Amino acid sequence: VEEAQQKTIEAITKAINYMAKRRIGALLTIERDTGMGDYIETGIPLNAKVSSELLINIFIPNTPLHDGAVIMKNNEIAAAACYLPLSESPFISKELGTRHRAAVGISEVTDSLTIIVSEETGGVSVAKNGDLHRELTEEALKEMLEAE
Amino acid sequence: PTPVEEAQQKTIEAITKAINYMAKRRIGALLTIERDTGMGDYIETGIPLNAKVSSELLINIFIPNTPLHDGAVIMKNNEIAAAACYLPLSESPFISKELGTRHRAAVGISEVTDSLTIIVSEETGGVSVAKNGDLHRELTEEALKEMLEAE
Ligand SMILES: [C][C]N([C][C])[C][C]OC1=[C][C]=C([N+5](=O)=O)[C]=[C]1
Ligand SMILES: [Mg+2]
Ligand SMILES: [Mg+2]
């Protein structure tokens, strides 16, 4: 179980690094104790093994799966192109767009952890508990995933 | 129809929609459908997906210049087993000389299995199928769907 969790963290951070460097927008939500089946059902079902390659291919711009969220559950990619609720929080930086508001929005009604890559800057952020943690390095994201 | 038959129809619809989209856009593709001869040895050379089929995922896999696009997708029933898989290259002299590695790999796997492989040419957008060592070129959408339904 521990080896599997580490393999999944490595797959995620490799995909995030690829997308950050190319400023490919991405939205990846990891289900925790709050069930997210209602959101999973809005997307395209995958129930796929995690790999950095599949995560990258999903988010390539102008492709069927790239808009909306990937939702991971039980160490698999449950679905892609999923709807998440947009936060109305007035405390999100006004320079950020829909992916960030969707990530904060799901984080207000679940215990999930969501990773966002900005298409404008390639900056990486995480939404949890209604807050957005901006300006993350790879080491910082890894620390969050291991804590989670 | 039974659930198995309905699932088969959904899988055929997903495949044909994806192939049609890729053909129109000259997106090269190589898609092998396992039949009664097991293809585990080739599946194991790729990136494991074990994913539910959708036209959307098939398209996303083959987008040029992406991690998953080079090599074969291998399907088992209603699942995409793996992407970026190796297939053996045919040496058949009945492969049109202008065709490249995707068509030769398709004919190659068809010589050692009963699988059906679909190819989209990145040069012309033409759609072909390899089966039992033969390549059938320039298929219409209707002809592909009928071949899949018969398979
Ligand atoms: C200057 C920073 N920009 C270009 C390098 C984007 C940030 O670069 C990364 C941030 C986070 C991860 N990470 O969380 O894995 C990977 C790359
Ligand atoms: Mg876009
Ligand atoms: Mg002809």
Side-chain angles (χ1 to χ4, degrees), chain A residues 1-20 22-138 140-148, chain B residues 1-8 10-12 14-16 18-23 25-96 98-144 146-151:
Chain A
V1 187
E2 286 167 349
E3 275 211 311
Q5 287 174 324
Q6 218 49 230
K7 183 174 181 303
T8 290
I9 291 174
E10 280 307 305
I12 288 168
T13 58
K14 182 175 215 213
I16 296 297
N17 186 64
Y18 179 103
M19 299 188 284
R22 287 156 187 86
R23 308 183 193 169
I24 292 164
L27 180 61
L28 178 59
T29 299
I30 308 175
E31 190 194 72
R32 304 305 290 140
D33 298 329
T34 306
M36 284 176 57
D38 290 349
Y39 305 98
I40 291 165
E41 281 308 290
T42 70
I44 302 303
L46 268 76
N47 304 109
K49 309 271 173 273
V50 177
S51 65
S52 57
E53 292 91 349
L54 177 56
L55 290 170
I56 291 163
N57 265 78
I58 283 166
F59 289 112
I60 297 292
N62 196 37
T63 61
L65 293 181
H66 85 286
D67 276 327
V70 168
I71 300 174
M72 290 189 28
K73 167 181 213 133
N74 297 324
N75 204 46
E76 292 190 333
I77 294 162
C82 297
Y83 161 84
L84 297 176
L86 300 187
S87 173
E88 303 274 18
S89 177
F91 306 107
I92 303 174
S93 317
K94 310 300 161 167
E95 70 194 3
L96 299 175
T98 307
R99 280 189 181 89
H100 298 84
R101 291 182 55 212
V104 176
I106 194 68
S107 87
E108 289 166 355
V109 297
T110 66
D111 67 337
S112 65
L113 185 158
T114 300
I115 309 164
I116 315 91
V117 182
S118 167
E119 79 169 50
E120 292 298 300
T121 65
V124 179
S125 55
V126 161
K128 174 118 186 245
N129 295 330
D131 290 294
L132 187 68
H133 304 283
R134 296 189 66 189
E135 298 271 334
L136 302 178
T137 66
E138 200 191 318
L141 176 58
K142 190 159 324 272
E143 185 193 356
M144 286 175 177
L145 289 173
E146 289 177 346
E148 185 56 56
Chain B
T2 72
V4 162
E5 298 168 321
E6 292 184 324
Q8 279 183 351
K10 302 254 190 243
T11 288
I12 289 171
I15 292 168
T16 55
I19 294 296
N20 302 343
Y21 176 99
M22 292 181 296
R25 301 178 173 54
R26 279 50 154 160
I27 295 166
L30 175 61
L31 179 59
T32 300
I33 304 162
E34 184 185 81
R35 299 279 81 206
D36 296 330
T37 306
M39 300 200 25
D41 292 338
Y42 304 96
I43 289 165
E44 291 161 20
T45 71
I47 303 296
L49 270 71
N50 304 120
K52 310 183 170 169
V53 77
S54 59
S55 56
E56 291 92 348
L57 177 57
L58 290 169
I59 291 159
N60 265 79
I61 285 167
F62 288 113
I63 298 297
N65 305 319
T66 60
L68 293 181
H69 81 117
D70 264 342
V73 166
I74 302 173
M75 277 178 78
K76 282 181 68 117
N77 219 40
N78 304 301
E79 278 201 345
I80 295 161
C85 299
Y86 164 84
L87 302 175
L89 299 191
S90 175
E91 289 295 341
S92 174
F94 302 113
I95 299 171
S96 296
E98 73 269 14
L99 295 175
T101 63
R102 282 186 183 90
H103 298 84
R104 289 151 201 291
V107 178
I109 194 67
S110 87
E111 290 168 352
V112 295
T113 68
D114 70 337
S115 65
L116 185 157
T117 299
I118 307 165
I119 316 90
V120 182
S121 168
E122 65 176 49
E123 295 299 334
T124 63
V127 174
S128 54
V129 161
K131 170 99 192 172
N132 297 325
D134 296 319
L135 186 68
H136 299 96
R137 298 189 60 187
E138 312 293 352
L139 299 177
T140 64
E141 304 179 343
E142 306 81 306
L144 176 66
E146 275 164 35
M147 287 184 73
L148 288 172
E149 286 165 350
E151 186 62 54

